[PDB]
């Protein structure tokens, strides 16, 4: 009974759900040759969060815990806590702690720490390689490479703030990160569990519509494209509204509010992704005041006007 | 079309549960393709949905369109969806009628490609 | 069908750019509905795409 809707927000007013940066544009392209299975930015239209998805835009790709120095190196192992510093439980029915990065790459940021007794603070450059054998966030363990071998204290609250991604400039340019390759959340040779499902258009002639940002680069020649299936604001809005899906597909029109002219229409599937009728890779050209408007409940086989 | 209408919440669309012309219950098992008088072409028929509330005689009429090519056009099973200009006026369980006026065409599209008078709907 | 193919990035699909049945250029302005021999029904026709590399005679299907 509660009416469904999507937020009245332009693309540039919204936030990527897979890294804490604003959305920049809309992109569509074929994706049948690889598995599209991001775990952040996953939410049903009636507001069930999936995968590793949580509500806070600023907690995406952040880690919190205490750190232990790896002797003979500038590397630290973080024993993960929950995002509110409560204990982390590896037996929960999730693939990894909420907000864990959902792509294989090298994420650079800053590890900060406060000593509780005197309020002294410290921060250091840190990189987490999410393809490393020591990247095991599902079991509460993540390794950071830092620029110090002594400065971090044990048994003190420590936070990783993500900034951007890096690439080895001596190898093929833009060969990493790989945004569609999930990390192995428990480390080597261990199957991921409790994943939000892979996503693909099921209607002939349709492609996913991606909400695209450009990740900051901190070194080398990284691939900084980052595509999410839902803006973080849609996740937040569906959770808040909790409106029941009346069919499997919500028909959205992308509208210029000055003229009321519809630029294109698309299908928002109830399990939480968008498709358009197009063949090939295309950067959508949109007015900066355009927004998505829910118009009606349709079925999986509604034929969209071509975009 | 005649029957009662159910609002599809969040939209301006209504589902009409078909009655017979004399307001009797409609029977999908009769040896006919669809209720007598059902449109027999695929297209977008525009008209007016009218309704009277029996307890006080209050009345209302709203612009309405039926797409007979829609998957929700199922008059043989007693179900037809209308697109209207309201999301609130129509009562449930009150006599409601669709009066046809004419046809429309998606005007950003090649002229005169719809309606298709020789394509039967899927009833 | 005969011609050259262009990969559709992100998919396992290819666009074939048609040649005539004798590998000559195809002319869309001829007074025909489509190239001679084109399927004349709506359906999903399965078969095999084969290709030869001119320079060394390597092949794939």
């Amino acid at each position, epitope marked *: 009974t509660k009416p469904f809707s999507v937020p009245v927000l332009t693309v540039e007013e919204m936030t990527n759900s897979r890294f804490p940066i604003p959305l920049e544009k809309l992109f569509t392209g074929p994706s049948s040759a690889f598995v599209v299975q991001p775990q952040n930015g996953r939410c049903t239209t009636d507001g069930v969060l999936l995968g590793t998805t949580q509500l806070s835009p600023v907690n995406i790709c952040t880690f919190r815990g205490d750190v232990t120095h790896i002797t003979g190196s500038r590397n630290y192992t973080m024993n993960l806590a929950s995002q509110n510093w409560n204990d982390y439980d590896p037996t929960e029915e999730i693939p990894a702690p909420l907000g864990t990065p959902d792509f294989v790459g090298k994420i650079q940021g800053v590890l900060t720490q406060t000593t509780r007794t005197d309020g002294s603070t410290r921060g250091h450059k840190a990189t987490v390689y999410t393809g490393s054998a020591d990247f095991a966030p599902k079991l509460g363990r993540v390794q950071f490479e830092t620029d110090t071998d002594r400065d971090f204290e044990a048994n003190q609250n420590t936070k990783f703030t993500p900034v951007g991604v890096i690439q080895d400039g001596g190898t093929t340019h833009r060969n990493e990160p790989q945004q569609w390759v999930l990390p192995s959340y428990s480390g080597r040779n261990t199957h991921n569990v409790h994943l939000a499902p892979a996503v693909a258009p099921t209607f002939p002639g349709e492609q996913l519509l991606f909400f695209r940002s450009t990740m900051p680069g901190c070194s080398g020649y990284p691939n900084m494209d980052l595509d999410c299936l839902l803006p973080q604001e849609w996740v937040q809005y569906f959770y808040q509204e909790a409106a029941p899906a009346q069919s499997d597909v919500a028909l959205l029109r992308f509208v210029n509010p000055d003229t009321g002219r519809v630029l294109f229409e698309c299908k928002l599937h109830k399990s939480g992704y968008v498709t358009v009728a197009h063949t090939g890779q295309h950067d959508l050209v949109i007015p900066p005041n355009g927004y998505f408007r829910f118009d009606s409940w349709v079925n999986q086989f509604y034929t969209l006007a*071509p975009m | 079309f005649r029957g009662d209408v159910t609002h599809i919440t969040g939209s301006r669309n209504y589902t009409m549960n078909l009655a017979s012309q004399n307001w009797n219950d409609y029977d999908p098992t009769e040896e006919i393709p669809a209720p007598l008088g059902t449109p027999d072409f695929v297209g977008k028929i525009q008209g007016v949905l009218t309704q009277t509330t029996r307890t006080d005689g209050s009345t209302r009429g709203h612009k309405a369109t039926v797409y007979t090519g829609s998957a929700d056009f199922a008059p043989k099973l007693g179900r037809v969806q209308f697109e209207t200009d309201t999301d609130r006026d129509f009562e449930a369980n009150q006599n409601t009628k669709f009066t046809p006026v004419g046809v429309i065409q998606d005007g950003g599209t*090649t*002229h005169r490609n719809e309606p298709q008078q020789w394509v039967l709907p899927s009833y | 069908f005969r011609g050259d193919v262009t990969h559709i990035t992100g998919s396992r699909n290819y666009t074939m*750019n048609l040649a005539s049945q004798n590998w000559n250029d195809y002319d*869309p*302005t001829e*007074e025909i509905p489509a190239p001679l021999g084109t399927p004349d029904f709506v359906g999903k026709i399965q078969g095999v795409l084969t290709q030869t590399t001119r320079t060394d005679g390597s092949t794939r299907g």
Partner: nanobody
Amino acid sequence: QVQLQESGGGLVQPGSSLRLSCAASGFTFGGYAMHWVRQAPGKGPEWVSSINSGGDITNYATSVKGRFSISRDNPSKTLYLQMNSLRPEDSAVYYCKTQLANRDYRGQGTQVTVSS
């Protein structure tokens, strides 16, 4: 009647860009594939480019690929040919042509001359 009128030709410098237009009337225009052809002196006509109704299918002669771009605006019933990196051998009368049912139609053409 079906009518097609090409415009936009002229005498231009090698390497320059030129945009041709074809104004159509007397049929829906939308719903029909449209074509550009050209004919140079002492040569038979040759196909240049084609486009379907929605513009999602286009094709080009090998001799103009990567340099020419076909487009259309169905509401104004106008076909366009954007010609970049023009070369002397691009000189010809450029015609717009279509096929409706079992008949072909083409405009009178517009002359393009590329020369130093």
